[PDB]
Amino acid sequence: VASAYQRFEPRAYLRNNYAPPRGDLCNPNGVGPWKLRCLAQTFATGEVSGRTLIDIGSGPTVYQLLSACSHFEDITMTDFLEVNRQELGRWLQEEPGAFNWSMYSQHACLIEGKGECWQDKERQLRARVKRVLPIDVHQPQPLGAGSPAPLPADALVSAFCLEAVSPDLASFQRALDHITTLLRPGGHLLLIGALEESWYLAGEARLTVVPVSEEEVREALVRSGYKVRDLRTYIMPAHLQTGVDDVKGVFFAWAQKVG
Ligand SMILES: Nc1ncnc2c1ncn2[C@@H]1O[C@H](CSCC[C@H](N)C(=O)O)[C@@H](O)[C@H]1O
Numbered sequence: 001v002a003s004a005y006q007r008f009e010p011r012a013y014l015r016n017n018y019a020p021p022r023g024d025l026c027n028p029n030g031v032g033p034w035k036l037r038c039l040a041q042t043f044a045t046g047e048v049s050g051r052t053l054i055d056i057g058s059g060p061t062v063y064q065l066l067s068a069c070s071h072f073e074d075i076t077m078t079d080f081l082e083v084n085r086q087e088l089g090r091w092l093q094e095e096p097g098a099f100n101w102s103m104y105s106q107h108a109c110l111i112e113g114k115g116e117c118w119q120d121k122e123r124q125l126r127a128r129v130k131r132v133l134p135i136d137v138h139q140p141q142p143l144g145a146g147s148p149a150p151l152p153a154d155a156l157v158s159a160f161c162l163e164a165v166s167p168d169l170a171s172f173q174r175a176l177d178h179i180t181t182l183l184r185p186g187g188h189l190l191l192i193g194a195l196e197e198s199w200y201l202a203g204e205a206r207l208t209v210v211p212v213s214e215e216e217v218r219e220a221l222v223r224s225g226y227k228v229r230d231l232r233t234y235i236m237p238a239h240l241q242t243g244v245d246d247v248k249g250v251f252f253a254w255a256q257k258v259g
């Protein structure tokens with residue numbers, strides 16, 4: 001897998017998944033609004049809080065932290081690929097050619113319903129993200145020996161990482177076990193992923209994915225020592241079915257480590 005991800009094209013990935021039609025946030029019934037809604041509602045309970053937060057396998061995207069950022073002053077983003085960390089860098093620093101997340105920022109504010117403008121939202125995220133670190137979920141210490149990341153983190157977020165980097169269910173489990181070591185007992189995990197997906201494209205790259213189900217995902221969380229607080233499923237409409245992948249649905253999990 002690590003070899004496959006070496007042809008991964010960030011801009012082709014952003015294009016396939018975060019631009020229209022999937023990047024069209026105008027329809028409430030799309031996968032974008034659904035993801036933002038899950039994240040916004042969860043943080044809106046006020047039960048997920050702290051000082052440090054780590055986003056696992058960020059890739060070139062930031063949407064997964066728009067709702068999160070107002071609850072954690074220290075945010076660490078991560079990814080296996082230098083090209084992704086670079087892409088993240090262009091947006092954090094407002095550099096030339098950065099990807100435009102404004103629609104997602106706008107929708108987050110919309111959905112959070114606190115009358116916040118999207119510039120203040122993006123400003124808070126940029127400010128609270130302290131670092132972008134290399135990571136490998138396959139290592140027992142996914143970050144490494146001495147990472148500048150405050151550990152253990154008060155909360156974890158990861159979207160479309162585990163299943164996308166694991167050849168099978170048992171790898172998925174280990175990878176979960178690994179990243180779980182980074183989470184303080186009682187802390188929270190917000191996990192988003194693909195359901196029953198085997199592949200997706202990212203330019204010239206063809207990534208293999210392990211097809212998992214809601215039940216497999218739940219059972220895996222329990223095994224890692226989590227209490228499943230919430231687990232929802234989004235079924236992928238035909239209109240969002242292109243040739244870029246074969247995802248059947250998307251899951252959202254809010255798990256609390258029972259340490
Ligand atoms: N061994 C590994 N450990 C952690 N991340 C890995 C990894 N191997 C590949 N990845 C990364 O996993 C990411 C999956 S794509 C997910 C991007 C983003 N989180 C989203 O919500 O869209 C890729 O960026 C890929 O580089």
Ligand SMILES: N[C@@H]1[C@@H]2CC[C@H]1c1cccc(C(F)(F)F)c12
Nearest residue numbers: 017031160164194200245247250
């Ligand atoms: N592997 C996942 C799939 C396919 C590319 C990655 C991604 C990013 C955002 C939404 C979705 C999808 F298809 F689940 F909606 C995906």
